[PDB]
Amino acid sequence: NAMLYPVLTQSRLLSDLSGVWNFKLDNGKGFEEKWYEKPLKDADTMPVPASYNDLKEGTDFRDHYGWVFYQRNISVPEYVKSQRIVLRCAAVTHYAMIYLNGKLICEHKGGFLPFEVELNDDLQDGDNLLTIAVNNVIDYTTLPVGGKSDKPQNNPNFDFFNYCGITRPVKIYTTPETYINDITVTADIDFTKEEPSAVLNYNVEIKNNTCKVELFDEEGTKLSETEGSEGTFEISNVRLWQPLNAYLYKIKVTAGQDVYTLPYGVRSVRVDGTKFLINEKPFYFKGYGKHEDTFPNGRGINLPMNTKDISIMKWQHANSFRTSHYPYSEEMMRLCDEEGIVVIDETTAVGVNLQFRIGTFDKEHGVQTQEHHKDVIRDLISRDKNHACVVMWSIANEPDSAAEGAYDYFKPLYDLARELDPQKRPCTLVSVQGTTADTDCSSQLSDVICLNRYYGWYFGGPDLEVSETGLRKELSDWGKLGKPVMFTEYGADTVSGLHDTTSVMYTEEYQVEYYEMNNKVFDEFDFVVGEQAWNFADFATSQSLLRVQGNKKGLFTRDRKPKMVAHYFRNRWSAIPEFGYK
Amino acid sequence: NAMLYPVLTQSRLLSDLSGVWNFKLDNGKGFEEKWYEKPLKDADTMPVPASYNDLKEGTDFRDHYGWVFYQRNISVPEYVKSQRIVLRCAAVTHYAMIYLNGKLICEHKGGFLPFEVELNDDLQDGDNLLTIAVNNVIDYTTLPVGGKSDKPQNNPNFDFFNYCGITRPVKIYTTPETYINDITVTADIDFTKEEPSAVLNYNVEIKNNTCKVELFDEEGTKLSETEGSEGTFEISNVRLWQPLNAYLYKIKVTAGQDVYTLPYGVRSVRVDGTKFLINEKPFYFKGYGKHEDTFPNGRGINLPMNTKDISIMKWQHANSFRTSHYPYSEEMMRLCDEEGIVVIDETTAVGVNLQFRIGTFDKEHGVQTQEHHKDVIRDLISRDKNHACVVMWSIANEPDSAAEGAYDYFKPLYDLARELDPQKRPCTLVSVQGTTADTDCSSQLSDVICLNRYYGWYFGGPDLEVSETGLRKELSDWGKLGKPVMFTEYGADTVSGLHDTTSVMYTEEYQVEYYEMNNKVFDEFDFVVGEQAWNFADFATSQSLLRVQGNKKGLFTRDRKPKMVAHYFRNRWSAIPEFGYK
Numbered sequence A, B: 001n002a003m004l005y006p007v008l009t010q011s012r013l014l015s016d017l018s019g020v021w022n023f024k025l026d027n028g029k030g031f032e033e034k035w036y037e038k039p040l041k042d043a044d045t046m047p048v049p050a051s052y053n054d055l056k057e058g059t060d061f062r063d064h065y066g067w068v069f070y071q072r073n074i075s076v077p078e079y080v081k082s083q084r085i086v087l088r089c090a091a092v093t094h095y096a097m098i099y100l101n102g103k104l105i106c107e108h109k110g111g112f113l114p115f116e117v118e119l120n121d122d123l124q125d126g127d128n129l130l131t132i133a134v135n136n137v138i139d140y141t142t143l144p145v146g147g148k149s150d151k152p153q154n155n156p157n158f159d160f161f162n163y164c165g166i167t168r169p170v171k172i173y174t175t176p177e178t179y180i181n182d183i184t185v186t187a188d189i190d191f192t193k194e195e196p197s198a199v200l201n202y203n204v205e206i207k208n209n210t211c212k213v214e215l216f217d218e219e220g221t222k223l224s225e226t227e228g229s230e231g232t233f234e235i236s237n238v239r240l241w242q243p244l245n246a247y248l249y250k251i252k253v254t255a256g257q258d259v260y261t262l263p264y265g266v267r268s269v270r271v272d273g274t275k276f277l278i279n280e281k282p283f284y285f286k287g288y289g290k291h292e293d294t295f296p297n298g299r300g301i302n303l304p305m306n307t308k309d310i311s312i313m314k315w316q317h318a319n320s321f322r323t324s325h326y327p328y329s330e331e332m333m334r335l336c337d338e339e340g341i342v343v344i345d346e347t348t349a350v351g352v353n354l355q356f357r358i359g360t361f362d363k364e365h366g367v368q369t370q371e372h373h374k375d376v377i378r379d380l381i382s383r384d385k386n387h388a389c390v391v392m393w394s395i396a397n398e399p400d401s402a403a404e405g406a407y408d409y410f411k412p413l414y415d416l417a418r419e420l421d422p423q424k425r426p427c428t429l430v431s432v433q434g435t436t437a438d439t440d441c442s443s444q445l446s447d448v449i450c451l452n453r454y455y456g457w458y459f460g461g462p463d464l465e466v467s468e469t470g471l472r473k474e475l476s477d478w479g480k481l482g483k484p485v486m487f488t489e490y491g492a493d494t495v496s497g498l499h500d501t502t503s504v505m506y507t508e509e510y511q512v513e514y515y516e517m518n519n520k521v522f523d524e525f526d527f528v529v530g531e532q533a534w535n536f537a538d539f540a541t542s543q544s545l546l547r548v549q550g551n552k553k554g555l556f557t558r559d560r561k562p563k564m565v566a567h568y569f570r571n572r573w574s575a576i577p578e579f580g581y582k
């Protein structure tokens, strides 16, 4: 359906269940022995939320295959049974199974978007046993996609480690028996007037059954009031949320005995040939593709680092960033609203490429994700549709875009995408290397062409000259489409500390020369509408000859320390405006 | 008074207020402009809990002198006013001032122990403005102690950076109008019987006015019941909480409409000449002195790293660790109970040494901390007295133990210490270098002699031979006291990655040779009862010629990566039992 970010409102409530839960690894027999009923014997300690792989020693934990069992003592005073009581799981990666006192109540497939379940009718009073059971297996039926010796081990079709567990927080909140279930505010700005202003349309609806909303500004001064399920809210000379200059209005939808408020930003996003326009102005993407990766948290949420990364980005003179290869935490999404970081939202659709002999979209011996793929496109837009920060959506990362059955697979998702977006924001998919304008189904399905090209590493490296003409060749060909092309990934593995006057691959010097060259070409084409480096920071992958203790293509280290190229970019972007770059 | 760790019990409640609050740095005029009343203009974003210094860029933030203002929207449904409502601040470092809707309600001096205040009578309904204002100034009236150019800047008398802000979590809980305010369980074990068992004494008392408690075990099976304010609870063949083998019983004190439960471990601690005995067995301390230091969290609580450190310690074959130079978070204290980590609790009493010409305890131009020093000795034992993990207390780190007025300053605190400990656990103070048996007031006030000697770095380095005879000389002299001496600090700064076949200072090789030498001597004296290296991991200090980007004496890096010496110790302690080392 739809899901609001639980907060503390007079109407509802909220208690963070996160702490150090009881924990045990599945041995196989664990399910039929019904460990979810009783407590867990010979248990271990495990903080929540955080992916568990890197919080114990030895390969037994890090590379475990199968199920893990979290157990937690839940308990409530009776005067709360008064109200709706809910259990919102912001993200237990992959598959989740919840037992309370010994009975499976909820289940989810997808480890990067929330899901909830109410407890009032099965919530016994006294000591209650909550048992979330997570599984880490990836195959052709999951997004992200896992591929195919002795003993079992997941083989990911993506280039980043497979951190699982309760990645984001577990909490309990409560609402009135008739409660708000979903807001939806849109906007049409009338840049008509030299001094502009506009009006917004709301769309509440509840779940017994009055309903009418109040409007505020940054500091808290009220500016209007109205009624209805789907009315208007005119504003005169409004402050447009802009990149690196966020203004957020707030909304107090008071209805029934329920009150919940919502921060909102007013901004316009629409493409026009080869120009990405926010607030009817020509933008340029300056930033990087990043990851929810820290140590030892794994993919577990780290609010401090979140703010630290945003500071570093502002320090570096950036504005954009694509969401990894999966939806990010809600706290980060909102934080980008307050700080004004234009964000590209991506689905957990990475791995839809078997060209790494059955084809990707072979309908019997191949991918089996279109269905679930559609769910996340629903559950994600259902979650962040009210974020001024989100300027665009990307349905998949590096899929077999130029293979038979590519169109017949994506257009259904594109349609569902641009149909559920209450703002009809642009949609795109970042194509892998080896795609051509005349070859990529994204040339027609997408509004913005976003490439993952690496001319200087995989291609041509270390010959930066032949690599240059290469990118120039492919780049100009993309101009024939007459639409905006932006690089969402270019980079080169470099080990911080390795220096050389005449650079070679993996040195800090080479990384700078690589970005110097590519950027030189990017600046030759007025239809290139933004550069995003891969990656923001070194992150953990799975072991292999081609990974020097994880991925080292980041501009910063895993501990957020700047490599030399981080300064090169801070200088270059220093001399590049958010608007008017042409 | 006393403070329990708030949890989710049928009786009470708990909602974590921690998130990303509104934030502003004080400009001076901020207080008279009364920013606590209104919201905060031109505000910034700052996650809570975490010390704020390292979460923005530029020296303006990191080295700020003075006040910071946190602001947060607090809000509650009326059906809760039913119950006691409380605001527990686990630790806003240094001085804290709380305003609600614009009125200062609570204040605290001390940034490493909790403090609470109830809100029911001034908690307006609707949108409420909470404003915690923190100050970072240190002087001769604070613990830790700050000493004494242009523009103001704190000068710490301790060797670690001055991370401040809301270091530990902010939350709200609720109790019944008559509630439990303090438990107190002691134990006498009758190792009489070849197969032993014992009985425990409880001590509840409330704050209107029945009262009688239930007892359980690991899994949840009940074993007894009784009544009274100060009764007994006999157990037969009980599992003694032991180092690296924790057994924790649980207690359900049901009284009035209030229920709160407590985990407890049964263990015996008593000194006998030159032998530290836990459960009437001769122990040996194997571990390190550590810090609440991570990046970029500052001193902010990091539950994931907590478990990660504990895993590394188990991986390394350790058992002990002294609490830095200040009390640690409650979550960590409890986690050591579950994992069985014997812990030395230390006060924020570091900096009581002005020999770094008025004397330390000069009663007019010198330290002014004895009073506040006594409060923390009260507030800390009031907090962790029920922790089987805590085997000992240390009242101060490296004070001027051998100066006039030393005795007259510490004995009052020692007395208050061993008088409020409901278990009469040993007390000690770690002496600085330059102290002698015949010179240190700790030779009489303390039960265990714990040295901070560094023969091989500050003394003698790099001449490891002369440094050896040096330590041998001072070490044997300490034998004359006929009591247990344990090194709580020995180490040597080394930059991970710097190697050399013939080692020199700051190389990994030297660090190993240093520990090799000192350990060789430690093993010569049957009255040395444990080695703790300084430090567990590299941590942040303030800048100076003698600090290579912080402190680098750790066995691991700041990101928890093992230097070569981390393996040396894992091997040595590998061959050293927790008991019977002599």
Ligand SMILES: O=C(O)[C@H]1O[C@@H](N2CCN(c3nnnc4c3sc3nc(N5CCOCC5)c5c(c34)CCCC5)CC2)[C@H](O)[C@@H](O)[C@@H]1O
Binding pocket: A158, A159, A160, A325, A397, A398, A432, A433, A434, A452, A458, A459, A460, A489, A534, A551, A553
């Ligand atoms: O890898 C990274 O760090 C990041 O890159 C992106 N993805 C790029 C495409 N893909 C690849 N991964 N690994 N190797 C190659 C590709 S494509 C390619 N093409 C190649 N040749 C044709 C193109 O011209 C040059 C020659 C060659 C190689 C590769 C490897 C060495 C031999 C030549 C998956 C990763 C992902 O978005 C990102 O998640 C990942 O983290």
Ligand SMILES: O=C(O)[C@H]1O[C@@H](N2CCN(c3nnnc4c3sc3nc(N5CCOCC5)c5c(c34)CCCC5)CC2)[C@H](O)[C@@H](O)[C@@H]1O
Binding pocket: B158, B159, B160, B325, B397, B398, B432, B433, B434, B452, B458, B459, B460, B489, B534, B551, B553
């Ligand atoms: O410093 C660390 O890393 C850790 O050490 C501990 N503390 C040790 C004592 N103290 C010192 N800090 N810095 N320098 C010296 C001392 S004492 C001393 N004595 C010295 N001479 C007499 C003893 O024989 C050798 C010669 C010399 C020096 C020092 C410095 C260089 C010149 C010779 C405060 C720090 C703290 O518990 C810890 O918090 C800190 O982090």
